[PDB]
């Protein structure tokens, strides 16, 4: 492909030189400006010929990102995958986004199966209360360390994070949590469906297509970090205030998360859409490992697709370690 | 002719430039980057290288314009558009041959927008400099060609007052304020922010957007850049007015919008001659602008 690109480019430059040559020969035939044009075109032709010979012969910010571990990838028989496969063929896998290509799967059916399996493994591993407690504490210190890195105070985030932790731990709020996400088109209420697909992955998607206004403000090389952040918080606060008006329940799941968004979104936007390579690289490492986690659990060659307990162990290992590497990347500065 | 030929080369270089944009591996990247560097250099070089008056406009199209506002002025047909418009163009430019009327209208528009920036408890000093800088620009006939190439580049047909000021700037402004980005609208209509908080946030956004737009201009001292200077200064006050929570400023904003629209409606109303309608269009214009500056002055 690249060879084809340069091949066509070589043809373009050759024709371009031919065009300039004709003009120069012509201009040569016929005032100071007339001679002036011939002089400039002459120089233009010289440079284009040199270039010809040479040919003949939201902005992502990269950051160190390479975490890997042992994987069980020696068998082709994966009853668990087949169970999801059969269920997928059965017609019991209703997705909300179908990120099959994002998960690098073969077809909707392979994604549909692997999803049904990943749903099971994640919720199964999160049956352990210690794992839920550890994961919450890790996400807290991770987002806190970042909000710290923007020279901000994460108290309000702690309040929203803790307020949200009490809601999900209290099972009496389960129906409302469903009524919310189901009203926003989410099908099941597992961790992946509500946390990964609905919140984070959509957030990484929303950060790739920001309004022309907000990004024009973030990428202003004449604004300090402080004024960038101050402007962003006002916008985010006013939008979440504007969205909170439309909610059917002011203490429901969407409102409880909007409280977290009001606090952590300003710092995250400033990271992804700012001009600081330090803050931007932190965001990319965070994004790259979260995406790599979703990529790893959707690979029969990285996790164990044979049983619930094997996959539950594997998906928890990948989740636990990816999040730690990010929290470390954040804690050390 | 030869100009078209060099224009053809410009297109070819532009396409090649984009195609080029699309240890040995690193070495090749450096080499192609150098090729792209040089290609852009020459690219830039190449770039540098009964109804009497109606009858006049009637069948005159047999009238190049930008937007068909046939409904905007509620006349019979598109062709009735071209006549009434061709007709309005002449009257405005003819009446604007008078230096006294040019001076009065400029003086009126100046104090009007200043009262606007004042209503936001702001200082219109920067606007005054931007307003004057362009007034010197349009008054100097040596900038006439550049003023064409700019507006000509944005699809404007004629260089009269109506085509550049009303059709191109004002009426476009009334439209863009009706479809604001989801972000800017939520901030202005935030009933929990003070007047100061809204204006300051709006100015930061507007200043940064115009910086992002100003980067794309072909002339940093051309007509469009001179207008962006006016926009950078008065637009924050105007946006906060139309989309804010103050009913005093909002009502003032609405009165201004209603007065300009009815003026455009009146000049496109038959119930004529070159001098007779030139007299008529100026009186309505003079009267509409005065009524607005007055209601602005008292508040
Ligand atoms: C970009 C970063 C964003 C960070 C902020 C937003 C995301 C985190 C905060 C919101 C958490 C929602 C929890 C409920 C979800 C749900 O409903 O999932 C249900 C899950 C799955 O088990 P189950 O309930 O199906 O088991 C039923 C058995 N019969 O179990 C829960 O109860 C939730 C478990 C997680 C609790 C939160 C832990 C801390 C936050 C996550 C850490 C990582 C942050 C994101 C990294 C990309
Ligand atoms: C939404 C509000 C926006 C406000 C800020 C932007 C608009 C106002 C400021 C910029 C003025 C541009 C002038 C060029 C226009 C043009 O092209 O008109 C061309 C006219 C007509 O003659 P001619 O040039 O065609 O003759 C060509 C012969 N060869 O003559 C001019 O030279 C312009 C005369 C007017 C000068 C400006 C008057 C003061 C500003 C307006 C105040 C009231 C508000 C507007 C009400 C409709």
Numbering used by the authors:
A (entry chain A): 109 to 138, 142 to 168, 220 to 495
B (entry chain B): 109 to 130, 143 to 169, 239 to 251, 255 to 463, 468 to 495
Task: Reproduce passages from the article.
Here, we characterize mitoguardin-2 (MIGA2), a mitochondrial protein present across most tissue types in higher eukaryotes, as a lipid transfer protein. It comprises an N-terminal transmembrane segment, which anchors it in the outer mitochondrial membrane, followed by a coiled-coil embedded in a largely unstructured linker, and a folded module at its C-terminus. We show that a channel in the C-terminal domain of MIGA2, lined by hydrophobic residues, enables this domain to solubilize lipids and to transfer them between membranes in vitro, and that this ability is essential for MIGA2 functions in vivo, including in both mitochondrial and LD biology.
We used an AlphaFold2-generated model of CeMIGA2C as a search model for phasing by molecular replacement, finding two dimers comprising four such modules in each asymmetric unit. The domains in the MIGA2C dimer are related by a 180° rotation. Maps additionally showed density for two four-helix bundles, each corresponding to a dimer of the coiled-coils from the linker region. The all-helical C-terminal domain of MIGA2 is globular, measuring ∼65 × 35 × 35 Å, and features an L-shaped channel (∼895 Å3 in volume as calculated in CASTp [Tian et al., 2018]). The channel is lined with hydrophobic residues and so is suitable for solubilizing lipids. Difference density reminiscent of a glycerophospholipid at the other end of the channel was modeled as such. There was no density for the lipid headgroup, as might be expected if lipids are bound non-specifically. R177 is strictly conserved across species and appears to be important for lipid binding (see analysis in “Its lipid transfer ability is essential for MIGA2 function in vivo”); likely through interaction with the glycerol backbone or headgroup of lipid ligands.
